[PDB]
Design a binder for this molecule. Structure first.
Ligand code: OGA
Ligand code: MG
Ligand code: NI
Ligand code: ZN
Length: 331
């Protein structure tokens, strides 16, 4: 069995190997990359996402989100307070202000220490989940707006045509902006490109051990667990690496830098934080190997998770017994 310790793997495809996206994901899996839940892909030196980032300041962040924490430094939840609209140029100036900017630090490990010590005492503002793309239309390789759609994959594998669309999302971050522990909708893959700015640190639990994270989460967030049998779908709970280690939960960590891709694999729980002002683009995708994960994915039906239009068909076709309850939670 390849990668039996479930380490995060880093790949350096050549320009020739960068042509065929599906083939390269399958290659990474042949080497055991999925066992980690997360892989890094460094693009060939010949490749670029677009020519420059000099003309992005007028993008609008319609609903910036202030991420307010509750709990203790290593075990906390966050809620999202809506703020007034602002442009990316305005948000960049805010991220660089004395109130929000990255503190002085020695290296990524010192900044990680400072994150976990101090995150709860601040409320950073995240420009998340903005439909759109920063890839040039002429970029033909690993262009996250030109991937094969999940609806087409389900049709190819299973024979059933379904409604829905699959487009990318932009994320504008600042110091301490946080992504809570989660797997993707329907335990899909995700791919994330860091277009510009400061790094993003990731934590991930191997898919084979995801239920160990779920059991810890139920212990640590006992009111939330009574409320919903899949409350990590709410995307609000944080648990630090120190707490994971104290509780014996297998995990790994890695820092993504500008110009690098990350892929999350089906049922790979992940969480993390941004180092300073940055912009990322991400999208969900599927392969043949996903179908069995989609059929077994948990679902939130309490009403909290609320998701896109396109998840309806995935539940309806892959999980017909669960459909009626899940749809009630959507309505
Ligand atoms: O970058 C973020 O805030 C969160 N991203 C992801 O969870 C992802 O790409 O799967
Ligand atoms: Mg602009
Ligand atoms: Ni994700
Ligand atoms: Zn729920």
């Amino acid at each position: 069995a390849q990668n039996p310790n479930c380490n995060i793997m880093i790949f350096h495809p050549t320009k020739e190997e960068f042509n065929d996206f599906d083939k390269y994901i399958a290659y990474m899996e042949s080497q055991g990359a999925h066992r980690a839940g997360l892989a890094k892909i460094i693009p060939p030196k010949e490749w670029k996402a677009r020519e420059t980032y000099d003309n992005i300041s007028e993008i609008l962040i319609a609903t910036p989100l202030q991420q307010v924490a509750s709990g203790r430094a290593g075990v906390f939840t966050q809620y999202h307070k809506k703020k007034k609209a602002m442009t990316v140029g305005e948000y960049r100036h805010l991220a660089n202000s004395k109130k929000y900017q990255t503190p002085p630090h020695q290296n990524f490990e010192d900044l990680e220490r400072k994150y976990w010590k101090n995150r709860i005492y601040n409320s950073p503002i995240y420009g998340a989940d903005i439909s759109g793309s920063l890839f040039d239309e002429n970029t033909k390789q690993w262009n996250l707006g030109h991937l094969g759609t999940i609806q087409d994959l389900l049709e190819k594998e299973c024979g059933v045509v379904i409604e829905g669309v699959n487009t990318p999302y932009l994320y504008f971050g600042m110091w301490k902006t946080t992504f809570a522990w989660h797997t993707e909708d329907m335990d899909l893959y995700s791919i994330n490109y860091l277009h510009l700015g400061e790094p993003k640190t990731w934590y991930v639990v191997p898919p084979e051990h995801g239920q160990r994270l779920e059991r810890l989460a139920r212990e640590l967030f006992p009111g939330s667990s009574r409320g919903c049998g899949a409350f990590l779908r709410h995307k609000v709970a944080l648990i630090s690496p120190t707490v994971l280690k104290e509780n014996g939960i297998p995990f790994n960590r890695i820092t993504q830098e500008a110009g690098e891709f990350m892929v999350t694999f089906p049922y790979g729980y992940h969480a993390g934080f941004n180092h300073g002002f940055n912009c990322a683009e991400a999208i969900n995708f599927a392969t043949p190997r996903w179908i069995d994960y989609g059929k077994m994915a948990s679902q939130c039906s309490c009403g909290e998770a609320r998701v896109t239009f396109s998840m309806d068909a995935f539940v309806r076709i892959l999980q017909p017994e669960r459909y009626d309850l899940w749809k009630r939670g959507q309505d």
